[PDB]
Design a protein around this ligand. Sequence first.
Ligand code: 4IP
Length: 1329
Amino acid sequence: AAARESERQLRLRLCVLNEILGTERDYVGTLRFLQSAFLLTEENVKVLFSNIEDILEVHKDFLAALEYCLHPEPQSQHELGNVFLKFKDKFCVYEEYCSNHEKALRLLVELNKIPTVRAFLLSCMLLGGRKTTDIPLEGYLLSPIQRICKYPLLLKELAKRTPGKHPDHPAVQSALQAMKTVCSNINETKRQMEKLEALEQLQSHIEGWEGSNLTDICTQLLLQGTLLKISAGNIQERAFFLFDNLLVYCKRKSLYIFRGRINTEVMEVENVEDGTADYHSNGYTVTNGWKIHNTAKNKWFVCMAKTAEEKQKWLDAIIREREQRESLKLGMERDAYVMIAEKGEKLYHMMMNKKVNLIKDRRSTVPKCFLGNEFVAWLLEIGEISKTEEGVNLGQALLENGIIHHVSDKHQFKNEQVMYRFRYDDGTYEDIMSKGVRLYCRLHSLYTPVIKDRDYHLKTYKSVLPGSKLVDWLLAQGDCQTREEAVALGVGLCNNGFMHHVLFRDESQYFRFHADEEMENDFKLVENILAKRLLILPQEEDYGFDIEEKNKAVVVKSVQRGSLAEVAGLQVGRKIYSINEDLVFLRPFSEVESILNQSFCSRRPLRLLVATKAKEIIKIPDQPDTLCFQIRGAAPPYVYAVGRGSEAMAAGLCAGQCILKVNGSNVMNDGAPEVLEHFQAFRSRREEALGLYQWIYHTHEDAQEARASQEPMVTLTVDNVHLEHGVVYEYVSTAGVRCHVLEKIVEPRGCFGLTAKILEAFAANDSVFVENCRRLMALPHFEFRNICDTKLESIGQRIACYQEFAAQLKSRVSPPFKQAPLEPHPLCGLDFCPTNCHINLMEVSYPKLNPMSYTQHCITTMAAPSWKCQEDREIQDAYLQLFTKLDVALKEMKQYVTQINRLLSTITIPSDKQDKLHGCLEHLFNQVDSINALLKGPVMSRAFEETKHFPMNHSLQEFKQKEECTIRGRSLIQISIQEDPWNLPNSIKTLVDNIQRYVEDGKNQLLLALLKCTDTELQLRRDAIFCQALVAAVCTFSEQLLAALGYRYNNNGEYEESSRDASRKWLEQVAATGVLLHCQSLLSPATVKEERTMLEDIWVTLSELDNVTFSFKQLDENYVANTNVFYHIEGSRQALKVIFYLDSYHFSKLPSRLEGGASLRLHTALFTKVLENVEPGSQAAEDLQQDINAQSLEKVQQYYRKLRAFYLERDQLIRPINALDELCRLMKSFVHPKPGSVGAGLIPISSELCYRLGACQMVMCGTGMQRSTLSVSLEQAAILARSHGLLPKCIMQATDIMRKQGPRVEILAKNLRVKDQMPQGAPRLYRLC
Ligand SMILES: O=P(O)(O)O[C@H]1[C@H](O)[C@@H](OP(=O)(O)O)[C@H](OP(=O)(O)O)[C@@H](OP(=O)(O)O)[C@H]1O
């Protein structure tokens, strides 16, 4: 074996020789190419290259000597030290270039700043054949320093390999000394040599090194440390080393042992949650963790750092490196590509000339074919190129650069006279709608008029634009730098049918937009309508209710007994409007039948509308048998249910109906018994006339309550509620197709039950808190505890008030919404429903029976946070968060303790098992230390200071000195493992439980301080306001998600995107990250102080709202009429986990991930700017506006980074992403007060931005009446123009039809007490026209 060891050393020496040979051959080839292609004023060339020729010749002689030395092939009996010494003097050639290198690199930097000389250098580099993208000139230029610093290393290496019997060792050592002296005499080589020697010393500490040497592909030790990992279902602590394109982890015990390393280019970075545990984590919770991949082993692993700061350091460094290298290589390749395109264009045109015309239609005849031979002869002839190979390689690049191609496209570029063709010959070789829409909006958004009526030929033209002035303004805002940009934009606009001359051009010609031409048919109405959304579900054979034509108006034929339609309350004799959100009153009868058949085969959940009126008269037979319904509320009674399969269906009886009069009897104020007695069944028996009947309930809230607890005609005058003032529109598309913008305004169907359940969750949470606080406090000081108990009684009183509000809000049915208060009064259930909530829908219907498209864009409305009847607050929030973190940490620590105890049981062997246990124990100790620090946080210290007036078995100083005890326990664990692993589990339990006791002490003190520093009035107000905001958010997202599940919602139609894909994509985008809420508050804080304070409150309540989290859980019912989304609440304030219980069809369509109830977060976004003209306190209000906008901009930008990262992890996005980037630039400009001119285009532009994203929309205003309808119609109009082919000639046509004719007048129709007015000084785009 020893002979084999000597033979291995011999092989190593041979390897050193072979690599020396290869390196020298490669270097001389580098010099060969550099001199052959390059050797632009000639002084530049000489200064750059200096003395490469003498160096090249020295290396040539050296290589010849070496080659003869290895003659015929390398062996172990050759000598080279003499060859080295002989050239020792010859290496002074390097000094000249080393000195010149500074000037050469500075000159090359200058040239790089020169595009033409740089591209010329690139062309020359590409000519020869070397792929330029591989290496730039700079590496070749700087190579000599590296080569000279490396030769000593090669000498010493070969000396180490050299067998002792071989006498060349002293000679090689002398040569090494000479090379070191030569390197030293030049200080520039000193830096490279010292870096190399330091790296080699670091490697010398590596035991069992593998792979190429570190100095080869590395230059700097970026970072190092210790970091854990999971692998093969096991854990093994490791220390990672960070070198450029190299991640080196070694098994520390020379202090390091090789385990494995990765190349970054085959490396991936993926981040996980703080609290995840999956198969890749082998069911282990993750802290500060992230995922990496080695595609070589095509397996992943997780890396968990000791702290957050450590993880941040690692991510920052690794990113920085990958970012720099990516940017460098992308820039180089793109510059090369653009240069190829430019040169190809120039030369192609030069060939197109008749002079020595090479492009020709020769022979199947091949039009415009050129021979590579004649092409290259011409290129050389013009002096551009000097070698046939240079040109043929360049033509090969062009063919590969998609500039030319073989006639048959079955060959590459060869010097032969092979037929070749350009992509221009065969013809083989957007941002306007958004640009124009914005352009108009911004321009007319200005305060000081700009786009104005002007006198042309002594006759004023209305609202024209001096193209000169257009360019001047475009430059004024940095929107266009040079007049070329503005002129190009104006040319586009002119061809784009937005503006035209009064009779684009860069002079004083005057232009107005076609929209003002319409101002100074294509958008109209058809009808106005009121509807009730009769959500129906499929039955055994049909969807429940047939139809028939009557008065050429689609009407119901009959409703079959025992129908889900009868569940929803579908009558006979009602005109229909929609069927599957698909219009039918503008369609033939048979077409409506086809729509129904298609929905059946698709088994879709219908979302119809109907033609039922605000009052109805009902005649019911009265047998002396049973009531067949119920009633409740001394307030205007509302039918509370109705039997199924009964004449009550026949008579036209439906849940929720609010009876006003019966047989000509005023009851609207009287109680239930009054109407009850009129029925013979009630006369027979008071309550015993309620025969068994499948009871169908107004809301889930009472359906569940009644169901759990249980386990000769009469005229009626019922006043309905929760109706839908449907409008229609019509217009002819820009594509020419026909459209119906079937707007609606629904009121939030499931609104009450949500306020009820949220207040119930508040009550239960407060009750549990009270129970625990009371128990803890029971066991100066006496009066302190008495004060605490008084606070606790106050909490209980708040709980009772919450319960009473729950009862009330269960009682109320009418009116459908909370009237805006005009007077103060004590609290009441109505105070926690949203103030004037609504859902301004939209649709579309134009074919791609025949195919059709659809969409939606909800826009909810709601007044400012309504209530009339911080430092300590942030302290309290800090306590809340600390408690939550501590408890969660205790839970996960217990889980992991169980995991490790099971592992110890399994330990009950190969040393790798001992080492894995060691690493696991180290992780346990690390988590323990983390928890200890969290306990020791200043929040806890202040808490203890607050609790000093209460007896306790632990003190701040006692806890601090417990650190020594914890260190002792850890050392005792170490002693146990050293002596016997069987003593370890007991110490594990001991420490776990002792620290648990510490935790309980801490949270006791935390709760004590919380009570010690809490006030109830502000908390009650805050809960109210959050309740409103969350109600709005929940209903909004309910609507939008329900849209998605129907395969409707579509926020990107400008890319010919089918609805189905848009729905799936948005839904899963949410499931990955979540949803963003855009609150476009339009309040005027400088106007009313009250609205300013309401703005502050809505802002802070949104900030709190961020914590909310949703999740889904199937839920089945046959006992509610027209609500799929049986909402629910649970959890607490800090994390209120709502459950949008959906139904079976509305559960299958849920993406795969969420089907188990996984958190969807919820991000807030608030933007404020007073629509009317700006005209210290108000300065502070404006500053508040700016801060709100800034924070919201940061949050949206972060979500944008997240979304782009998702998609990149997940081509067509180039358009939307660039447009989004421009939008972000616009927003930054707006919010940034860089040196009124911005007007108010922020509102529309930002609305566009959020709609482009997956965001669900929402808007709040002063009073819900005037300041909001305008903005809403504006946004709807812009969406239409941007998404479904409207004629941008009709923009203001739509903008004014809406704000004058459409649903948005029913806000004033159903509401009269409200007080509001339209804007008085708004820009043109807002004011009515
Ligand atoms: O020593 P044994 O008991 O065989 O376990 C080894 C180590 O855990 C390695 O981890 P480390 O690299 O930290 O030393 C791991 O390499 P990876 O982490 O690269 O997967 C091996 O992965 P497999 O070869 O896939 O099992 C695993 O088998």
